[PDB]
Amino acid sequence: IVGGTSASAGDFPFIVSISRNGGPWCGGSLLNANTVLTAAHCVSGYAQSGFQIRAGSLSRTSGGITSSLSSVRVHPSYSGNNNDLAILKLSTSIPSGGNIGYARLAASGSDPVAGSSATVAGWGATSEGGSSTPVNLLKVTVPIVSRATCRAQYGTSAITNQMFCAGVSSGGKDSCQGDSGGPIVDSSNTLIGAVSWGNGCARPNYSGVYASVGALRSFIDTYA
């Protein structure tokens, strides 16, 4: 997260950190006791055994409940940067209550509205190309960017309606490497997307791109 602040305890009760090879890698969202939603590019084709999930902690290294993966399901049509979602099944259940909760998904057929305020969270880099990786969770609030502007930035071929964009026109606030797969929520804390891709991080005129929960409910609801 670039341009962010420290998350408070209980801000994203459903957020999980995903380590790979015992080191930081991605984020995700707990959908229910045995299911995580993350980005396809976090897991697609990688050895599933390298991954561990941690829930119920602001820290990605300490506290909460951990689980290995029992299975990985990438969106059947994951193609390029498009349809960038995967469903992970956990071999250790993660009960809700106390400090853990499950995500509330955006309505089917919904698209985040340009100009509305969204919040993204994760343990990724704090600058483009950054070497340090936060141990405790960060968050940042950015406006949704109209898909037309996003297409102006990336080219019409690069942005689909399975994606949406968010960021500030002068730059400086964004998700970044190691945030992939983690949640972006609307001002009510409804899960609208997963961190997906971008040209760099926090560049003026290159918005962060997110996999759209509203557009992909059919995949999520079938395997969750």
Side-chain angles (χ1 to χ4, degrees):
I1 302 288
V2 185
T5 63
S6 290
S8 295
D11 278 348
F12 320 102
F14 59 89
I15 197 170
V16 305
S17 59
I18 306 180
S19 62
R20 190 181 160 208
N21 295 323
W25 183 249
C26 279
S29 295
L30 199 62
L31 299 189
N32 61 53
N34 65 329
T35 311
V36 169
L37 185 67
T38 190
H41 89 258
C42 287
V43 289
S44 175
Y46 300 124
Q48 287 180 12
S49 62
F51 296 105
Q52 187 167 77
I53 282 49
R54 182 183 300 278
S57 188
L58 287 177
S59 169
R60 56 170 174 81
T61 60
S62 94
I65 299 174
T66 62
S67 182
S68 301
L69 303 185
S70 58
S71 67
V72 174
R73 187 189 290 257
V74 176
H75 199 275
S77 290
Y78 174 49
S79 359
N81 289 140
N82 198 39
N83 298 317
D84 192 13
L85 291 180
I87 291 283
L88 318 181
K89 296 278 166 152
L90 305 185
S91 46
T92 294
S93 301
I94 306 192
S96 53
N99 60 291
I100 292 173
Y102 306 141
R104 171 210 236 164
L105 301 177
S108 192
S110 68
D111 191 39
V113 174
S116 70
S117 171
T119 300
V120 57
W123 296 266
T126 54
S127 313
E128 184 182 313
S131 84
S132 63
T133 163
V135 172
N136 291 307
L137 185 64
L138 302 183
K139 66 183 181 176
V140 67
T141 296
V142 286
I144 300 301
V145 173
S146 77
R147 190 170 293 94
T149 294
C150 217
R151 292 185 164 135
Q153 295 175 343
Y154 290 96
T156 297
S157 287
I159 311 291
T160 65
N161 289 261
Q162 302 75 232
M163 302 171 195
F164 71 91
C165 303
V168 300
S169 66
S170 30
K173 290 183 165 135
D174 200 355
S175 53
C176 201
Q177 274 52 56
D179 290 322
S180 287
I184 180 166
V185 300
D186 68 12
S187 55
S188 309
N189 284 323
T190 300
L191 186 67
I192 56 166
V195 175
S196 181
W197 70 279
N199 285 4
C201 311
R203 297 184 190 170
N205 314 315
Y206 289 100
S207 299
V209 194
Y210 297 85
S212 181
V213 165
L216 290 162
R217 287 289 299 273
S218 293
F219 166 70
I220 302 164
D221 290 0
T222 300
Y223 297 108

